[PDB]
Amino acid sequence: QDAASGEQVFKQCLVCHSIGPGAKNKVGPVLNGLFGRHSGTIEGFAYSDANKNSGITWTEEVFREYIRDPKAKIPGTKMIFAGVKDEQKVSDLIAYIKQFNADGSKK
Ligand code: HEC
Numbered sequence: 640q641d642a643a644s645g646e647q648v649f650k651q652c653l654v655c656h657s658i659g660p661g662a663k664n665k666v667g668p669v670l671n672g673l674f675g676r677h678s679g680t681i682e683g684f685a686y687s688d689a690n691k692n693s694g695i696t697w698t699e700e701v702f703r704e705y706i707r708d709p710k711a712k713i714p715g716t717k718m719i720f721a722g723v724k725d726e727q728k729v730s731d732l733i734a735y736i737k738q739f740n741a742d743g744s745k746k
Pocket residue numbers: 648649651652654655656666667668673677678679680681685686687688689690691697702706715716717718719720723732
């Protein structure tokens with residue numbers, strides 16, 4: 640779906656997470672270069688065992704399921720959020736993010 644739209648839905652994400660350039664960790668790990676990266680991999684982030692010992696590897700398909708309801712895919716994770724149980728939204732989320740990658744740029 641669409642990114643311009645998806646930027647809106649990340650608003651409820653930015654509260655704890657960063658993206659783009661000069662993105663530094665916060666209550667949660669920066670979401671730069673998310674797709675492909677290994678779960679609990681970004682450094683300077685005190686991941687939970689649950690997150691980092693999962694072996695997830697964040698592909699669009701598992702994020703799609705995660706975001707829907709976190710506690711169910713990484714049961715016991717530190718991310719206390721009742722997901723994006725909203726299908727239009729999730730798709731645009733996965734458009735905006737995918738757009739940054741690694742150091743916050745376009746690809
Ligand atoms: C504050 C309450 C948060 C909101 C709102 C969102 N996220 Fe989050 N996220 C938060 C924490 C504390 C953590 C760490 C979990 C742990 O157990 O260590 C996370 C983690 C993620 C991850 C995992 C990343 C990795 O490198 O493994 C992802 C993919 C993620 N968060 C995505 C995400 C998105 C897209 C959100 C908007 C809908 C979102 N989170 C909300 C804190 C918070």
